[PDB]
Amino acid sequence: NANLAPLPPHVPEHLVFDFDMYNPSNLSAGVQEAWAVLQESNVPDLVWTRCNGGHWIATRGQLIREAYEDYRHFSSECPFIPREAGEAYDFIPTSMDPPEQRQFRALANQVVGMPVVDKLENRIQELACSLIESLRPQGQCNFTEDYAEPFPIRIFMLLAGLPEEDIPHLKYLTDQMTRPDGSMTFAEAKEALYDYLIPIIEQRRQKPGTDAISIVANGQVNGRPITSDEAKRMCGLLLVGGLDTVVNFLSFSMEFLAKSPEHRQELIERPERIPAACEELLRRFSLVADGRILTSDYEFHGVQLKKGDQILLPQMLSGLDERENAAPMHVDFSRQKVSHTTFGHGSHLCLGQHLARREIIVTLKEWLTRIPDFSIAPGAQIQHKSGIVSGVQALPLVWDPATTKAV
Ligand code: HEM
Ligand SMILES: CC1(C)[C@@H]2CC[C@@]1(C)C(=O)C2
Numbered sequence: 360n361a362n363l364a365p366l367p368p369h370v371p372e373h374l375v376f377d378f379d380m381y382n383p384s385n386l387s388a389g390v391q392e393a394w395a396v397l398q399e400s401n402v403p404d405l406v407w408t409r410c411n412g413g414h415w416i417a418t419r420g421q422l423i424r425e426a427y428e429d430y431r432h433f434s435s436e437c438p439f440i441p442r443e444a445g446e447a448y449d450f451i452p453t454s455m456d457p458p459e460q461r462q463f464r465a466l467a468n469q470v471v472g473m474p475v476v477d478k479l480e481n482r483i484q485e486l487a488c489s490l491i492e493s494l495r496p497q498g499q500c501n502f503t504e505d506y507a508e509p510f511p512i513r514i515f516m517l518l519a520g521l522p523e524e525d526i527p528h529l530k531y532l533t534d535q536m537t538r539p540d541g542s543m544t545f546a547e548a549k550e551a552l553y554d555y556l557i558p559i560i561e562q563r564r565q566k567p568g569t570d571a572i573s574i575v576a577n578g579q580v581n582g583r584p585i586t587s588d589e590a591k592r593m594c595g596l597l598l599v600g601g602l603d604t605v606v607n608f609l610s611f612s613m614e615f616l617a618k619s620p621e622h623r624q625e626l627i628e629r630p631e632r633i634p635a636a637c638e639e640l641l642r643r644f645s646l647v648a649d650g651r652i653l654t655s656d657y658e659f660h661g662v663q664l665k666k667g668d669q670i671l672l673p674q675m676l677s678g679l680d681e682r683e684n685a686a687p688m689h690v691d692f693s694r695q696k697v698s699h700t701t702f703g704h705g706s707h708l709c710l711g712q713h714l715a716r717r718e719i720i721v722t723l724k725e726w727l728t729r730i731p732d733f734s735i736a737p738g739a740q741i742q743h744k745s746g747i748v749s750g751v752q753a754l755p756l757v758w759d760p761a762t763t764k765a766v
């Protein structure tokens with residue numbers, strides 16, 4: 360096929376599995392199901408796909424976790440597939456490896472960490488409620504557009520002190536970096552995001568506010584002033600994290616709940632199980648998949664990896680691995696040991712995971728208490744999309760207003 364890069368001389372012929380992370384063949388069964396094909400009976404722990412330029416793929420949690428822990432061999436310098444995107448990718452602190460990464464990660468943690476989340480609690484609560492109550496009497500909604508996007512994005516824009524009217528442009532840009540449609544290369548989308556930030560960063564370094572951008576722009580890294588370029592590379596990352604993570608996850612979760620009245624009932628009858636349900640949904644509907652680049656020739660699990668080789672280490676796959684969780688595709692809110700790497704693993708563990716969990720738990724609680732019974736619009740053929748971050752194209756929901764409650 361013209362979409363297959365010639366197999367490099369060092370890659371064993373028997374390890375070839377032409378998986379396309381941007382258009383997996385079994386996508387119609389669900390994106391997680393599509394990626395799970397990499398864990399079928401006769402698929403090795405480590406395979407090579409000739410798609411998207413050619414790269415390795417660790418298919419089991421054991422190797423995914425090991426690779427993410429070994430930053431000396433598996434560098435974050437070129438973390439995205441295809442290589443062109445990975446090479447243009449220079450966000451901070453994600454494109455850096457420890458020890459260099461740390462001073463910047465500390466600053467980022469200060470702007471989106473737990474302390475910040477705690478302060479945002481009220482506003483997160485208020486927005487969730489206002490959005491749901493407004494939808495409640497209508498008996499229907501386009502979940503992706505009416506809640507999944509506005510809820511987490513507005514909260515991020517509030518945190519970043521950015522005009523909500525700027526969302527359409529920024530969201531288009533972020534999506535081109537995670538699930539490109541062809542209109543822009545990763546490099547072009549990144550350049551536009553940086554172009555957007557440059558004057559805002561300059562403005563806030565002159566007259567700082569209390570928003571995340573001002574904090575980053577006027578911050579220090581281990582005692583010395585952060586530069587304008589560094590602030591830009593950090594703020595670009597924050598924007599992507601805030602506009603294309605939780606937004607997609609909420610849709611996967613709500614699609615599932617709309618299709619499973621039993622699970623909805625469980626959370627309605629036992630509201631205290633919501634935090635645990637949140638973690639199980641994070642495992643079952645994990646959605647991120649980036650990777651690393653080999654810093655030198657290295658034998659890993661009996662496979663000769665060559666310097667420069669890219670390896671996709673799907674955060675999504677660890678928790679779906681039957682070797683980590685029995686009956687992985689089954690959603691069990693009572694699951695005893697919820698194992699996963701949905702928020703990454705190693706030195707780059709997600710900094711916004713605390714904000715993410717709050718947004719998810721608040722959504723589940725506030726939605727179920729107002730709209731306890733809902734379902735997918737009759738006949739709707741839900742479509743998923745695959746990429747660095749997978750998502751749901753559209754999620755039409757319906758419900759009888761008579762069954763709702765105006766809390
Ligand atoms: C469902 C929600 C989320 C998921 C599944 C998710 C997942 C991840 C993953 C897998 C990584 C590490 C990638 C790597 O190792 O290369 C990461 C890093 C990060 N995430 Fe999230 N994230 C979520 C929400 C957020 C939010 C809301 C923000 C806030 C802006 C955010 C900010 C970050 C930052 C700053 C990093 C980089 C940390 C570093 O490189 O050291 N994330 N996230
Ligand atoms: C892989 C990620 C989820 C992580 C936060 C946004 C993201 C797309 C990155 O570029 C680093």
Ligand SMILES: [K+]
Pocket residue numbers: 366367368369370371372
């Ligand atoms: K070969």
Ligand SMILES: [K+]
Pocket residue numbers: 436437438445446447448449454
């Ligand atoms: K790079």
